[PDB]
């Protein structure tokens, strides 16, 4: 279908790799980038991990493991395992060498790579970071801040940071009104202050605005669904505006459409193409929502899977989104560079937006305007 503003792909079917569907869940099958999928496979105490290398032909490396949780680095051949709440060990798979080894003061509830350099930890009470590649094997993670009370009684599902590693957001969900509500702790390290807000998804990104040259402004992108009314909302807002810059970002608020009877749905991931200024917002039930970043305008709504999504990641040099569904398909979406401008011009009937997107991305389709 040649009008679609996106390309939709299956990167791999995990089930065709002999992997069991019993481990397709958020804790057991981890997905930090579209480079690797790590599956924790439980069979008695004869426990194991299957590492799928998406770059190298879906090659699986399988190892016995004594840990309860395992993640791969976004790019490097580095695996992180934790056990018994508090025991953490990180290895260079290639040399077999141990990068980090320590025992934490409090059990880890959630972890993920915040960047290529920094691993984030959330405990019952605390939020911690580790500069894993400092060459100090036994150096323990540094306290970032205590958890805000708004995250009490939630399941921790995300921890994100900006590139500068001085703004952060932790996301927890809980059942309210028989539906999923989300709570976010936002933390500014420079101010040493936290703020509690409502939401299910969060990401820090950057945008180049006319008249600021080649200097980005930073924006936070967050999406919520109200657990009582069902109303969905995306917000985009500036953080730490650099004063010399003459263009700044005016906050945007845009609807996220959920069918009223989509009782159990909520936003489950958000990823941004900084190059193209495109937000990808994915829901648990498999709905994809595209937004343009400058204007917050909704571009597209559709569904890419009928099976629920349980984990997601950036795709293709962070210009798209990838996800894994309950049937074990790894699915991917990114804009079609050749079709997105005609789509905006002619389907959305929106000349000004088409020119915004064409200009930012160097894309075709606006050359007869």
């Amino acid at each position: 279908m040649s009008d679609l503003p996106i390309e939709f792909t299956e990167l791999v079917d995990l089930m065709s790799l002999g992997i069991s569907p019993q481990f397709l869940d958020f804790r057991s099958t981890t997905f930090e980038s579209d480079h690797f999928v790590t599956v924790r496979e439980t069979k008695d105490g004869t426990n194991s991990v299957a590492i799928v290398d998406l770059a190298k032909g879906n090659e699986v490396t399988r190892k016995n493991m004594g840990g309860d949780s395992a993640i791969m680095h976004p790019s490097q051949m580095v695996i992180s395992v934790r056990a018994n709440g508090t025991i953490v060990q990180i290895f260079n798979l290639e040399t077999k060498s141990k990068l980090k080894s320590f025992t934490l003061d409090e059990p880890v509830i959630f972890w993920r790579w915040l960047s290529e350099t920094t691993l984030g930890f959330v405990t019952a009470r605390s939020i911690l970071t580790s500069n894993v590649f400092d060459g100090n094997v036994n150096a323990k993670p540094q306290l970032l801040t205590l958890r805000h009370a708004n995250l009490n009684n939630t399941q921790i599902i995300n921890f994100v940071a900006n590139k500068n590693l001085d703004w952060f957001a932790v996301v927890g969900i809980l059942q309210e009104n028989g539906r999923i509500a989300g709570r976010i702790q936002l933390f500014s390290k420079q101010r040493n202050i936290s703020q509690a807000i409502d939401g299910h998804v969060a990401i820090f990104t950057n945008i180049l605005l006319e008249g600021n040259g080649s200097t980005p402004v930073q924006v936070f992108v967050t999406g919520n669904r109200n657990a009582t009314t069902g109303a969905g909302e995306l917000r985009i807002i500036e953080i730490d505006h650099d004063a010399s810059l003459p263009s700044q970002y005016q906050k945007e608020t845009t609807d996220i459409f959920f069918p009223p009877d989509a009782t159990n749905d909520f936003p489950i991931a958000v990823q941004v193409s900084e190059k193209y200024g495109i937000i990808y917002l994915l829901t648990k039930y498999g709905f994809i929502h595209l937004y343009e970043l400058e204007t917050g305008t909704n571009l597209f709504v559709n569904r890419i899977t009928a099976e629920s999504v349980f984990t997601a990641a950036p795709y293709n040099h962070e210009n798209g989104i990838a996800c894994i569904n309950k049937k074990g398909q790894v699915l991917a979406v990114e804009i079609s560079t050749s079709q997105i401008v005609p789509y905006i011009l002619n389907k959305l009937s929106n000349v000004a937006l088409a020119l915004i997107v064409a200009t930012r991305g160097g894309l075709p389709g606006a050359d007869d305007l």
């Binding site: 493991m65 395992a70 056990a83 290895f91 077999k96």
Partner: peptide
Amino acid sequence: GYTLIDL
């Protein structure tokens, strides 16, 4: 000695 994963 102890490793959480057997490489």
